[PDB]
Amino acid sequence: IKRQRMIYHCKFGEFGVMEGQFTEPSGVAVNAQNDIIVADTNNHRIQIFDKEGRFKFQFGECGKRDSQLLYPNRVAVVRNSGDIIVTERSPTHQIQIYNQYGQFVRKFGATILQHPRGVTVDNKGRIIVVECKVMRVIIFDQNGNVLHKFGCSKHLEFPNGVVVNDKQEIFISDNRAHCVKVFNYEGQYLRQIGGEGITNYPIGVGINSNGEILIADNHNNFNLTIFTQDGQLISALESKVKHAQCFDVALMDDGSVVLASKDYRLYIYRYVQLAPVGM
């Protein structure tokens, strides 16, 4: 399976505690304006940048009080409102909601969650959370009500990412299963996408505005493999560079994907030709 070569056109970040610097970019998400939202874990803050990697603003500070965060890992965006969903690591296993201006909205799930490892929001505003160490998926509404939850220790081994479509299907990247596992809101395993030799050791999963499923991995260089929701292989790319441990990926509309890694940086990769104007 040959893949097209891809190279990032933008990279930003460096070690630090100041604006635009990171300690650990554990989570990344993108809003409707293509702004890049990042969970800077050891700085207990969320940083927002424009589609070009330029710093816009930050919110959150170490603490356990409204507007404060404690080891934030992972973020998602409510597309229609610009609201930012944040999850806090195991110790403070809960989620928080901030609006597009960084104003605190609410927090909940501290007595429900345990090991949040992935989060996303569907087109109806529902918040989907996937947990490891106990393989479980929890679904909440904007107000913090548990709409449903199901275990999945029979189909998941090292969940590390999740996206959803508009037909109540949950796509979870499974690092040790070398693929993405698909389930429905009832918790039924439906099918898998990718597999050994195609999507080895996925580090995350993303979904296109076109509904395509993007599976990323850093097994021998950074690789991106694109599939339809039914599991049909459409494209395959690879970077000529091996990155530092990669934490998460997020899709931008315009054929781009953002990668967050342990080297205190985020890289933006073009995974499809933008086509000439007029064509």
From Swiss-Prot:
One of the record's GO cellular component terms: cytoplasm
Comment text on domains: The NHL repeats form six-bladed beta-propeller that mediate the interaction with the pumilio repeats of pum, and are essential for translational effector function.
Major localization listed first in the record, in broad terms: cytoplasm
Biological process, per Gene Ontology: asymmetric cell division; asymmetric neuroblast division resulting in ganglion mother cell formation; brain development; ganglion mother cell fate determination; negative regulation of cell population proliferation; negative regulation of gene expression; negative regulation of neuroblast proliferation; negative regulation of translation
GO molecular function: mRNA 3'-UTR binding; translation regulator activity; translation repressor activity; zinc ion binding
Keyword entries, A-Z: Cytoplasm, Metal-binding, Repeat, Repressor, Translation regulation, Zinc, Zinc-finger
Part of the intact protein present: 759 to 1037 of 1037
Subunit structure: Interacts with nanos (nos) and pum. Acts via the formation of a quaternary complex composed of pum, nanos, brat and the 3'-UTR mRNA of hb. Not recruited by nanos and pum to cyclin B 3'-UTR mRNA. Might interact with mira; the interaction seems to be important for brat localization during mitosis. Interacts with Ago1.
Function as written in the Swiss-Prot or TrEMBL entry: A NHL-domain family protein that functions as a translational repressor to inhibit cell proliferation. Plays a central role in translation repression of hb mRNA by being recruited by nanos (nos) and pum to the Nanos Response Element (NRE), a 16 bp sequence in the hb mRNA 3'-UTR. Probably recruited by other proteins to repress translation of other mRNAs in other tissues. Negatively regulates expression of Myc in a 3'-UTR dependent manner in both neural progenitor and epithelial cells. Regulates expression of mei-P26, possibly at transcriptional level.
Record's protein name: Protein brain tumor
Keyword Cell inner membrane listed: no
Lineage of source species: Eukaryota, Metazoa, Ecdysozoa, Arthropoda, Hexapoda
Species this protein is from: Drosophila melanogaster
Domain of life: Eukaryota
Location in the cell: Cytoplasm; Cytoplasm, Cell cortex
Tagged with keyword Kinase: no
General remark: The neuroblast overproliferation phenotype of brat knockout mutants is used as a well characterized brain tumor model. Early stages of tumorigenesis can be investigated because the tumor initiating cells of the type II neural stem cell lineage are known.
